[PDB]
Amino acid sequence: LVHVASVEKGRSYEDFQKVYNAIALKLREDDEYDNYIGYGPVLVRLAWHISGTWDKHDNTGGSYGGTYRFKKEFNDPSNAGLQNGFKFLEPIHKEFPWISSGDLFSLGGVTAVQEMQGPKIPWRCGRVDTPEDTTPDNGRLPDADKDAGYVRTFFQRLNMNDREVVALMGAHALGKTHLKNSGYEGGGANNVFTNEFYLNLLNEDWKLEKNDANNEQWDSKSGYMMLPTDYSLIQDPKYLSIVKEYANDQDKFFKDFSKAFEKLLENGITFPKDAPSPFIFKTLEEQGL
């Protein structure tokens, strides 16, 4: 199964920068959401969940087809709460109806990372909407009540290695868990992208507690939280090495996250040899906007 990127007709960097800017301006405007976290973190999760359905074995799922717009996928229990991201993006979809759904969802994640002072994430256009019958079934996204071996095996399906897994999980320094969505509660409630996930793992005093949904989670003296799968990154010696690396080198972490996140968002997509080079969007701050 081949999905060839096809540039939206006549569109170029300037067009997508406009879309980026509209998302970024709305991120700034809609500041109240989730107790003033704003929509950045949920947009990042949305980009990841639309991409994370991919299966390297048969090229099913993946960001290309924009299939989250269909009920089977938007009602996946694994996707509970992402409807907030979808609603945020609705007015952008309306202003720019030419951008494909996969392009929009993934560009929402790029924009969020950047505007939250994260690394630049190069991004390619050309995802093409595919029909409802191409929507992947529920159950391809990961469980949180599992161990390091589960995580490692899980991410092999997405063609991610240990370094890529550990880098991607640094996004758990964004936002929070919400009991009603996932059965976990708490987190940093951060909206600025840092390597704090790694520092907190190493430096906080963690206790394994049960939350109000009767699930186990790791809670810190100082008010942070880690899922069992997060904490597994310091229980496995290979992951622990990499955690320490990223805790001690912000720039390395940013660079590795950027590569892994772009890869995640592009899995399944064949880019023609004469496709445009990836775009690197300027932040509103860089533009003086």
Ligand code: HEM
């Ligand atoms: C083993 C893999 C992972 C598991 C089990 C996992 C699980 C979870 C869960 C249970 C939540 C809370 C959802 C809620 O209650 O609202 C969450 C939130 C989040 N996840 Fe993950 N996740 C994983 C990997 C990733 C990756 C790879 C990224 C992106 C690179 C990501 C980004 C996020 C973000 C940004 C949030 C916060 C959303 C918000 O504040 O609304 N996660 N994740």
Ligand SMILES: Oc1cccc(F)c1O
């Ligand atoms: O209908 C939509 C709303 C938000 C984002 C999209 F990509 C849509 O197709």
Ligand SMILES: Oc1cccc(F)c1O
């Ligand atoms: O463990 C977490 C997962 C997602 C977001 C957070 F803030 C967390 O502490």
